Amino acid sequence: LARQAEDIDTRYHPSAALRRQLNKVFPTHWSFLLGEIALYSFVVLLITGVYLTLFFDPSMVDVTYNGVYQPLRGVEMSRAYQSALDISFEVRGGLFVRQIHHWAALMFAAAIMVHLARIFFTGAFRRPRETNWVIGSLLLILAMFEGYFGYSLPDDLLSGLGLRAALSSITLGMPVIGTWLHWALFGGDFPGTILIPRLYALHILLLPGIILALIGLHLALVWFQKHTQFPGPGRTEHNVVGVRVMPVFAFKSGAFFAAIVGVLGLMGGLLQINPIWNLGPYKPSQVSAGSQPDFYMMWTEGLARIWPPWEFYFWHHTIPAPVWVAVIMGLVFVLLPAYPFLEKRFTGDYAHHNLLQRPRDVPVRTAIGAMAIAFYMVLTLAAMNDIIALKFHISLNATTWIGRIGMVILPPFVYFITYRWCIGLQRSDRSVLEHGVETGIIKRLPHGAYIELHQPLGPVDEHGHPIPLQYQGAPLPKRMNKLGSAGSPGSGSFLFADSAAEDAALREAGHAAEQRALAALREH
Amino acid sequence: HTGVDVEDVPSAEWGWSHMPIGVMHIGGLLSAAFLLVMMRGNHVGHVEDWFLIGFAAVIVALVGRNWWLRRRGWIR
Amino acid sequence: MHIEARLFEILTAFFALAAVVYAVLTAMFATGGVEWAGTTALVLTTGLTLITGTFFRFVARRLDTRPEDYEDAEISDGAGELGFFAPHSWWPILISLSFSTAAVGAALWLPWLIAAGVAFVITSVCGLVFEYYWGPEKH
Amino acid sequence: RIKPSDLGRVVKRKGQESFNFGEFFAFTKVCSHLGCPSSLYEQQSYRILCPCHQSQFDALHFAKPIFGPAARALAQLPITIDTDGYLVANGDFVEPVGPAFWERT
Amino acid sequence: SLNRPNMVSVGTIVWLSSELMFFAGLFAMYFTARAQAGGAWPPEPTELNLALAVPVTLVLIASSFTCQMGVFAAERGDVFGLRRWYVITFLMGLFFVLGQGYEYIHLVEHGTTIPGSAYGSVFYLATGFHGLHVIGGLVAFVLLLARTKMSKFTPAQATAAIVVSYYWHFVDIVWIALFATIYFVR
Amino acid sequence: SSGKYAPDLAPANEQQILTAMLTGPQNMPKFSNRQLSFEAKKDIIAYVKVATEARQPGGYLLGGFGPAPEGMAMWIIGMVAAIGLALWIGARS
Numbered sequence A: 001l002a003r004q005a006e007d008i009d010t011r012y013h014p015s016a017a018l019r020r021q022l023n024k025v026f027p028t029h030w031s032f033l034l035g036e037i038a039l040y041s042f043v044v045l046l047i048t049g050v051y052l053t054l055f056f057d058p059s060m061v062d063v064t065y066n067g068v069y070q071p072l073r074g075v076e077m078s079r080a081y082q083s084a085l086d087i088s089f090e091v092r093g094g095l096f097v098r099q100i101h102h103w104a105a106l107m108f109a110a111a112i113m114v115h116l117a118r119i120f121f122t123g124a125f126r127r128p129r130e131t132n133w134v135i136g137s138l139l140l141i142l143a144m145f146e147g148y149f150g151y152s153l154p155d156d157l158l159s160g161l162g163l164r165a166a167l168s169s170i171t172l173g174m175p176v177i178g179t180w181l182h183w184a185l186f187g188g189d190f191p192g193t194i195l196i197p198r199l200y201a202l203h204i205l206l207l208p209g210i211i212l213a214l215i216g217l218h219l220a221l222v223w224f225q226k227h228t229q230f231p232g233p234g235r236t237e238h239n240v241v242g243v244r245v246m247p248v249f250a251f252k253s254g255a256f257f258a259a260i261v262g263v264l265g266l267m268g269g270l271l272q273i274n275p276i277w278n279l280g281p282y283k284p285s286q287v288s289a290g291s292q293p294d295f296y297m298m299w300t301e302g303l304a305r306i307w308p309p310w311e312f313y314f315w316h317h318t319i320p321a322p323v324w325v326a327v328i329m330g331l332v333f334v335l336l337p338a339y340p341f342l343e344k345r346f347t348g349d350y351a352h353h354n355l356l357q358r359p360r361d362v363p364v365r366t367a368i369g370a371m372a373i374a375f376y377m378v379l380t381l382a383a384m385n386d387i388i389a390l391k392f393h394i395s396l397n398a399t400t401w402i403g404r405i406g407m408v409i410l411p412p413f414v415y416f417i418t419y420r421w422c423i424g425l426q427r428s429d430r431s432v433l434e435h436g437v438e439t440g441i442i443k444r445l446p447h448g449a450y451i452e453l454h455q456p457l458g459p460v461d462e463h464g465h466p467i468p469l470q471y472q473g474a475p476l477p478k479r480m481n482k483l484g485s486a487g488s489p490g491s492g493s494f495l496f497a498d499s500a501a502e503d504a505a506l507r508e509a510g511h512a513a514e515q516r517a518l519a520a521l522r523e524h
Numbered sequence B: 001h002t003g004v005d006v007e008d009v010p011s012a013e014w015g016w017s018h019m020p021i022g023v024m025h026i027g028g029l030l031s032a033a034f035l036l037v038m039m040r041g042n043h044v045g046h047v048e049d050w051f052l053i054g055f056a057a058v059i060v061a062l063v064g065r066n067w068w069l070r071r072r073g074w075i076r
Numbered sequence C: 001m002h003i004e005a006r007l008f009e010i011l012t013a014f015f016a017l018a019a020v021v022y023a024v025l026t027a028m029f030a031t032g033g034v035e036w037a038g039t040t041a042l043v044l045t046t047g048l049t050l051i052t053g054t055f056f057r058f059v060a061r062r063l064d065t066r067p068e069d070y071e072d073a074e075i076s077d078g079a080g081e082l083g084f085f086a087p088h089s090w091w092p093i094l095i096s097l098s099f100s101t102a103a104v105g106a107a108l109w110l111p112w113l114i115a116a117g118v119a120f121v122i123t124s125v126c127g128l129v130f131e132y133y134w135g136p137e138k139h
Numbered sequence D: 001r002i003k004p005s006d007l008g009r010v011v012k013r014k015g016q017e018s019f020n021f022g023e024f025f026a027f028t029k030v031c032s033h034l035g036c037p038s039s040l041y042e043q044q045s046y047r048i049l050c051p052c053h054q055s056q057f058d059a060l061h062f063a064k065p066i067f068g069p070a071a072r073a074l075a076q077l078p079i080t081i082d083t084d085g086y087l088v089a090n091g092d093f094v095e096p097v098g099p100a101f102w103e104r105t
Numbered sequence E: 001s002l003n004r005p006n007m008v009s010v011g012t013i014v015w016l017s018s019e020l021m022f023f024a025g026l027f028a029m030y031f032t033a034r035a036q037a038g039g040a041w042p043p044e045p046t047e048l049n050l051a052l053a054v055p056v057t058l059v060l061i062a063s064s065f066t067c068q069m070g071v072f073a074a075e076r077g078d079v080f081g082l083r084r085w086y087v088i089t090f091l092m093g094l095f096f097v098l099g100q101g102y103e104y105i106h107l108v109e110h111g112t113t114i115p116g117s118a119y120g121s122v123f124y125l126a127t128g129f130h131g132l133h134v135i136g137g138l139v140a141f142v143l144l145l146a147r148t149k150m151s152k153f154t155p156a157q158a159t160a161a162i163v164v165s166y167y168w169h170f171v172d173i174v175w176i177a178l179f180a181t182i183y184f185v186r
Numbered sequence F: 001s002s003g004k005y006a007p008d009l010a011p012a013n014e015q016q017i018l019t020a021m022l023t024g025p026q027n028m029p030k031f032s033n034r035q036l037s038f039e040a041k042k043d044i045i046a047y048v049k050v051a052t053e054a055r056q057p058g059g060y061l062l063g064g065f066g067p068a069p070e071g072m073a074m075w076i077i078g079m080v081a082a083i084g085l086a087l088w089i090g091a092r093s
C-alpha cells in the first residue's frame, strides 16, 4: 500500500540502506549452499527443541512405569526415561517430532563437515577470512558436544553406557586434575543426582545461545566481507559477478529452505531412529553388544578401540591408556583452527585473495586434505568393529588389527595417489588447451591415415592447426555436446508437436538471447 | 613458491606444489618405527608380528631406494 | 558379408546334426531315456548360431560389396568418415564398482546392500548412456 | 564354576591362592579399561569379553588381559561358605575396582 | 568408409544369442526333475490358473506390435509417434509384470514356495529371471525416451530405438516358449 | 572373539529357547533350573517372542542396531538428496 509505505518512510526513512541491501550481489555456484544446509538444519532443530521442552522432565529420581507400553510395566526407571517414553507413546505427534529432531541433528553435523571440506579445498580461508575460519572451527566443536549432550538426556542403557565410559572414565584418568574435574562435574561419583538436570540446562540454554551468537557473528562477517568467487570470464579480484538479492536470491534461498524442511520431514516420518523403548533404563549391572555413539563422535570411540595399551607406573602414581585418546583429541582440536596461519608461515604467502583456487591446482594441500579424510574414515570404521565382523564374516581380532595397521599405512598412500591424480588432471587441461576439444569422429585420409577431427576454442593458423591458449584458472570443456553442438529437439511437449513456426521462433529467440548473454559477459 | 618446474607441475604458479623430501623420508622412518613399537607387550599370538615386520621392511626399502637414487643422480 | 554368414551356417549344420543324433541315441540305448540336459544345450547352441547366421544372411542379401569384401580394391576406396568412437570416460569403473557392491550383497545375504547396489547400477548406467547427449546447463 | 576336569590349568595370582572356594572364583564385573560391564563369558574357551572396546581376559589365568585396550587384570574377590551352607565373601578386594587414576588402581 | 551394415545392431544380436544360452541352462534345469517326478508330476497343492496366464501373454504379444509400430515411426524421423508407441509398450509391459506378481502372490498364499518342493523351485527360478529381463527392458525403454527428449533426433537415436525394439522381441519370444512349455505341455 | 558369534533369535521357537538355556550350547553358559527358575524362563521366552515379532512404530527398522546404520542412511539418502537439490538450484563452472 502507498499510505503504509509513505508513513514508514516519514518515520524511519531507511530508503538508502534498504536499497543498498536490495542491490547486494551474490555468486551462484552450487557449492555455496552447503552452509545454508547447516543453517536450515539449525533452525529446524530450534523449533523442534522448543516443542520438546514442553513435555520433558530431566530428573534422575526413580519411579515405576505403569504406562501403556506393556513390556515395560512395573520396571524401575528414572523420571527422564519415563518422560521420553511418554513423549514417544502418549503425546499425539511426539515420536514424529523427536525423530525429526534427531534426523536434523545428524544432517546438521554432516552439512557442517561437507562445508568445511569445501572451504578447505577451495582455499576460502586465506588472509581476509582467517577469523571466520576460526569461528567456524569453534562452531564445529560446539555442535559436536551439543549433540553428544543431546542424545544423553533420555537416560537409557546405551546412552548411559556411552556417558559412563567416555565422559566419566576418561575425565577420571587425566594426569593431575582428573578426579577433581570428575567430581566438580558430577557432584561426586559417577551416578549422582545432578548430572541429567545439569546436562539439560547446558543443552537447552547455554550451548544453543553460544552457537546462535557465533552463527550471528559468522554470517555478519560473511555479509560484510563480500563472498569469494571462482575465476571466470568477467571475474576479477575487485568485483562480484552474480545476481542481486531482491528478486532472485531471496527466492532461491526460501525455496531451498522449504526443500530441506521437506526432506527432513520425509526422513523423520519414514525412518526409525533411536528406539529407546527397545532398550531399558540405564542400570550399572546390565550391558549389550550395543556401542558406537552418533557418527560425529565415532572417531573418538574408534581411537579408544584401536589404541594399544601403553601405561606408565612410577612412584605411587599411574597414567592409564585413555590419556592418549584425550591427548590426541585435544591435539586435533588445537591443530584445526591453526591451519591458515601454519600454511601462510610455510608457504610465505601474505597477500589478499578474493578469487578461489581449483583443488587440482593446489596438489600439496589437496593431498593433505585427502590424507586427513582417510585417517578420519579409518577411525570411523574402527568404531563399528563388531557390526562389521558380524555382518561381513571377519574375525574381531582381525578387524582390530586391520584398523590398527591401516591407521598408519593408509593416509600416506592416499596422499601419494592424490598428488599424482591432481597433476594428471592438470596435464589433461593442458592437452585440451594445446589442441582442440576431441570430437570422437575419425577420418581415413585416402592415403590411409587416421585422424580425429579436433575442434578449436580460438583462432587457427594458416595451416589450420589451432593456436595454443593460456591457462586462466577456469574449467575447460571436454565433451562436444556441452558446447551447443547437436541439441534442441522438436518443440512439442512430450507426445504432440507444436507448430513449425513456433518452433523456429523459439529457437531463434533462444539463440539470440544466449549469444547476447555471452557477449555481455565476455566483452565488458 | 620455493620452487618446482612448470615442466613437472603445469600449474606451479597457481598454488602450493612442493613439499621437501626430508619430511617424507623421516615420516616413512617414523611410521616404520611406530609399526615396530606397536608389538610391545605382545599379547598371545604372532601372526600379526609378521605383518608388522613385513610392512616396516617394505617402507624402509622404499625410503632407502628413493634416497639412494636421489643421491647418485638418477632422480632430479 | 558372405563368409561370416557361411561360417555361422557351417556351425549351425554341425550343431543341429549332433543335437538330433544325440537325442535319438539317448532315446534308445540309454539308461533312463533322453538325457534332457545335453540335448537342451545342443538345441539352443544350434539356435544361437542360427540366429546369428540368419541376421548376417539377411543383411548380406540386401547389400553391395564393401571395399574389405572386394579384392583388387584400393585404399582410396575407403576414404571418408568413419563413425563416432568414444574418447576418455570414467563411467565404466563406476559401473563395475556398483555391480561388485550388488554381488557382495548377494554373496553375503544382505538385502539392503543388494538394493543399494541395484540403485548404484541404475545410476551409473544412466550416467554412461547420457554422457554424450546432455546439453549445456540452461541456467 | 569351572569343570572339575581342568582345575589344574589355573595359575593363581601371587597373593590370591586361597581366594577360590574349590571351583568357584568370583571375579569383578567392572572392566579395568573404562568401567563397562565385562559380561560376555565364553564357557568352553574360558574367556571374558567386554562389548565396549573388546578386551579379553583369561578366566583361567587370574583374569589377565590377553587382547584389546585393557592393560590390568580384573580384581578377584575372596569367597567361602558359612555355617549354614550359603556362599559369602571372605573379606574385601585387595585393590581398587574399575578404571585407574593418578593416585592408584 | 561408411561400412553400411550397422555396428550396434550386430553387437546387440550377438549378445541376444548369449542370453539364449543362459535360458538354455534354465530350461535344462527345469526339464531335469520332471523326468524324476512320477505320475502326477505337478504336486497336488499345485494348480495352474489359466484364467490369468493367457491374458498377460496376449498383452505381451500386443506389446510386440506396438513396439514395431514405434520403430516404424522411428525410421521416418519424427520423435512424437515414437514416444507415443513406446509409452504404450511400457504401460503394457508394466501390466504384464503386475499380473505375474499377483499370480505369484496367489500361488504362494496356499501352496508352492521355493523351499517347498522341486516343482516350485524350477517354476520360480525359470519365470522370475524372465520377469527380471522384462524389468530390464522397461528400464531400457525409459532411458531411451529420456535420451530422445534431451537432444536432436539423429540416425544414432534411430539405431538405439531399433536395438531396444528387437531386445523386446527376443523377450517376448522367450516368454512364448516358456509359457507353451509350462502350461500346455506339462 | 576369534571366529565364533552369537546368532539371531528370530528363527527359534519356545521349546528351542527353553532347551537352549537349559543345556548351554557351545560357548554359551548353562543356566541351571535352580539358578533361573522355570517361571523366570517362561517370562524371558515371552519377552523374546515379543521383541522379535512386534512391528516398529517409527518407520523402517534400519537393522536393529544403533546409530551406525543411521549414519549410513543419513550420508546415503539425506545428504545425497540435499546435494542434488543444490546442484539443481545453483550453477556450476
Ligand SMILES: CC(C)=CCC/C(C)=C/CC/C(C)=C\CC/C(C)=C/CC/C(C)=C/CC/C(C)=C/CC/C(C)=C/CC/C(C)=C/CC/C(C)=C/CC1=C(C)C(=O)c2ccccc2C1=O
Pocket: A113, A114, A116, A117, A120, A295, A298, A299, A332, A335, A336, A339, A368, A369, A370, A372, A373, A375, A376, A380, F068, F071, F072, F075, F076
Ligand atoms: C578436509 C579436512 C578434514 C582437512 C582438515 C585439515 C587438517 C590440517 C586439520 C587437522 C585435523 C587433524 C590433524 C586430522 C583430522 C581427522 C579427524 C580426526 C578430524 C575430526 C573431525 C573432522 C574435521 C571431520 C572431517 C571429515 C570430512 C571433512 C567429511 C567430508 C566427506 C565428503 C567430502 C562428503 C562427500 C559426499 C559423500 C561422499 C556422499 C557419499 C557418502 C559417503 C560414503 C560418506 C562416507 C561416510 C562418512 C563421511 C561418515 O562420516 C560415516 C559415518 C558413519 C557411517 C558411515 C559414514 C560414511 O559412509
Ligand SMILES: CC(C)=CCC/C(C)=C\CC/C(C)=C/CC/C(C)=C/CC/C(C)=C/CC/C(C)=C\CC/C(C)=C\CC/C(C)=C\CC/C(C)=C\CC1=C(C)C(=O)c2ccccc2C1=O
Pocket: A138, A141, A142, A145, A202, A206, A207, A210
Ligand atoms: C570453547 C569450547 C567450544 C571448547 C570446548 C569446551 C567444551 C568441551 C564445550 C562446552 C561444554 C560446557 C562445559 C561449556 C559451558 C559454557 C557455559 C554454559 C557458557 C554460558 C554463557 C554465559 C555463562 C552466560 C553469562 C554471560 C552473559 C549472560 C552476559 C552478557 C550480557 C548480554 C548478552 C547483553 C544484553 C544487553 C543488550 C541487548 C544491550 C547492549 C547494550 C547497548 C549496545 C548499549 C546500551 C544503550 C543503547 C543501545 C542506547 O541506544 C542508549 C541510548 C541512550 C542512552 C543510553 C543507551 C544505552 O545504554
Ligand code: HEM
Pocket: A042, A045, A046, A048, A049, A050, A052, A053, A056, A084, A087, A098, A101, A102, A105, A108, A143, A146, A147, A150, A151, A152, A153, A154, A203, A204, A208, A211, A273, A274
Ligand atoms: C543446536 C543443536 C542441537 C543438537 C545437535 C541437538 C541434538 C539432540 C539429540 C540428538 C537429541 C536426542 C533425540 C532423541 O531423543 O532421540 C536431543 C534431545 C533433546 N533436545 Fe536437542 N539438539 C539441539 C538443539 C536443541 C535445542 C535448541 C533445544 C531446546 C530449545 C533442544 C531440546 C531437546 C530436548 C528437550 C531433548 C530431549 C527430548 C527427547 O530426547 O525426546 N535441543 N537433542
Ligand code: FES
Pocket: A165, D031, D032, D033, D034, D035, D036, D038, D050, D051, D052, D053, D054, D055, D068, D069, D070
Ligand atoms: S571398557 Fe571394557 S574394553 Fe574398554
